[PDB]
Amino acid sequence: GMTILSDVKALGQQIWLDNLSRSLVQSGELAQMLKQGVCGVTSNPAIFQKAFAGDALYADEVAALKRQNLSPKQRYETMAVADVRAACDVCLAEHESTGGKTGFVSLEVSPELAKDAQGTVEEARRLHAAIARKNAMIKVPATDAGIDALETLVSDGISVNLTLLFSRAQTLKAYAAYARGIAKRLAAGQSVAHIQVVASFFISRVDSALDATLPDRLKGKTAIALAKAAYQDWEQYFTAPEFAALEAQGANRVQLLWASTGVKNPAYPDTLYVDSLIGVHTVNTVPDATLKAFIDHGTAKATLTESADEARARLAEIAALGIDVETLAARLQEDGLKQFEEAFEKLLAPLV
Ligand SMILES: [Cl-]
């Protein structure tokens, strides 16, 4: 039942909604969910393409914007920023009630900037300013350029959602870049206590990529095993003396965010990823249908840290079979950028 969302909160995990649309906000639905266990919102270009195509409340906004001398991209941004700002205002009470630790809404920069650190910084700074809300995060793909940009944006005091992570190595590089940005601010005597960063580490896409050629003992196991090991990396990084010195001065840890947590194979229980990845100081962003399933028949237990030994043994067998999870991760990141760019192009065409 719905109290499962407060049980998960008590176990230390935030549940966010992996969807956004004009009607979600205008109807009052988002506000009601913020009172009843949902703590934040994520978007991406695929989510906006579907929203723009399906939600009748955009039609008049598009008609209005087609009266103006604006590029399709700016028409998109006007729409998307307005949805995000409004969602931020819905989430603000929640955000303030936790000292700015929850209640965030994420907006992604243009996918075509993904390998351009400067351009990414410039767009992220602009979108942060355009939204004009303390509880907005700018979402940036975790390419090498993205991690360069992360360090700059953190040093600028901007909260960031680093996305399309599939790699423990690339996640650790992101933590080190965050720590450099924080340290720069502390040395400059600047505030860091409200800067928040999440690392959106994708789940179902790993299983989708591998399962058809894995032996049955490993099917549906790899993504969770990778996440479990990533969380152990996280504990080790952030408890080390180097970070503890920053946290003592008010720095926030980055938090892992489980993304792509809808189940994509009907052979697996639809609550598999939410049920399996609950642990303290994490986020899980879930699509509507998965939130529904979790409320109906999910389980709230501290599962993320259970059976780490077996996670590691399975990752050892994945390697034994010849699957290089770093190669896989890079491929998945590149495919995810291509797909987001496809979605973005599809969104823009009706705005010409
Ligand atoms: Cl995303």
Backbone torsions φ then ψ of 122, nearest 5 degrees: -65, -45
Length of the chain: 352
DSSP 3-state assignment of 220?
Answer: coil
| Cα 47 to averaged position of ligand 1 atoms, centre (Å) | 9
Is 270:1 a contact under the CB 8 Å cutoff? no
CATH T-level fold of 1-352:
TIM Barrel (3.20.20)
For residues 268 and 272, what is the distance between their CA atoms, to the nearest angstrom? Answer: 7
| Cα 299 to averaged position of ligand 1 atoms, centre (Å) | 25
| Cα 19 to averaged position of ligand 1 atoms, centre (Å) | 10
Residues whose CB is under 5 A from ligand 1 (ion)? 44, 163
| Cα 49 to averaged position of ligand 1 atoms, centre (Å) | 13
Selecting among 139, 301, 338, 346, the annotated active-site residue is 139
Resolution to one decimal, Å = 1.1
Q: Is 184 a catalytic residue?
A: no
For residues 86 and 89, what is the distance between their CA atoms, to the nearest angstrom? Answer: 5
DSSP string, 83-133: HHHHHHHHHHHHHHHTTSSS--EEEEPPGGGTT-HHHHHHHHHHHHHHH--
The structure was resolved experimentally with X-ray
For residues 160 and 177, what is the distance between their CA atoms, to the nearest angstrom? Answer: 12
CB half-sphere exposure, 127, CA atoms < 13 A = 33
E strands, 51-196, are: 105-108, 136-141, 160-165
Which structure tokens are listed for 253? Answer: 């840890």
| Cα 202 to averaged position of ligand 1 atoms, centre (Å) | 8
Residue with the two structure tokens 């030994």: 309
* Domain positions in the chain: 1-352
